């Protein structure tokens, strides 16, 4: 087994950034009067 963790961390950071960016879109819809 290749004992490296980059693709795993890559997908984890990707989904995390996706959820975070969705929440920033929620802020964008919110603060916009």
């Amino acid at each position: 087994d290749s004992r490296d963790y980059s693709t795993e961390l890559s997908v984890t950071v990707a989904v995390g950034a996706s959820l975070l960016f969705l929440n920033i879109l929620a802020f964008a819809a919110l603060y916009y009067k």
């Binding site: 963790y5 961390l9 995390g16 959820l19 929440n23 929620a26 919110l30």
Partner: protein
């Protein structure tokens, strides 16, 4: 304009609930899955460990990952720091599940009150998750963690091992929890219009 504002507020509330459920899923997954820290090529023995659970290899060119640890039995947890971190993460999970339960209160109670209740409870869950993530490294100086990772490890000293997906997902959960708390606060203060 009023109907547009009402539709936007309703949609943002629904999406906030969806993201709250997603963050609860994240909190449960990081609490359960033992992939907070992981071996490396320089590690003498292969294995990993979470908040409380830990699997280690025997070291005979095979996996044979003997797995020990359980939050339900505090004796098996390697260190007091691990116990405190696991307790804080459990408390955060309880808080977010409590807000998911309090979603039902939108039927009866005023929307501002329920929004602010989950705002405060998500804030407390975020602080508990921060405390757990800050206290968890203190137990790296435990004898079994040192044995697995190596002698270089210590309090706030990763050494040879590497942080795996669960720890970074927990950090993402902290960020998402703080964000959801702020979103709930602003939604509660905005629905009055």
């Amino acid at each position: 304009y009023h109907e547009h504002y009402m539709r936007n507020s309703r949609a943002i509330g629904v999406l906030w609930a969806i993201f709250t459920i997603c963050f609860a899923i994240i909190n449960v997954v990081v609490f359960i899955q033992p992939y907070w820290v992981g071996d490396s090529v320089s590690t003498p023995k292969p294995g990993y460990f979470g908040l409380f659970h830990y699997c280690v290899g025997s070291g005979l060119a095979g996996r044979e990952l003997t797995c020990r640890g359980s939050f339900t039995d505090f004796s098996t947890i390697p260190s007091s720091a691990f116990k405190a971190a696991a307790f804080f993460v459990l408390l955060s999970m309880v808080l977010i599940l409590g807000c998911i339960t309090c979603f039902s209160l939108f039927f009866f109670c005023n929307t501002a009150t329920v929004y602010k209740i989950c705002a405060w409870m998500q804030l407390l869950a975020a602080l508990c998750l921060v405390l757990g993530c800050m206290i968890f490294p203190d137990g790296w100086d435990a004898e079994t963690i040192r044995d697995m990772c190596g002698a270089k490890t210590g309090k706030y000293s990763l050494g040879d091992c590497s942080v795996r997906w669960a720890y970074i997902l927990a950090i993402i959960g902290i960020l998402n929890a703080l964000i959801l708390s702020f979103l709930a606060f602003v939604l509660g203060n905005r629905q009055t219009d």
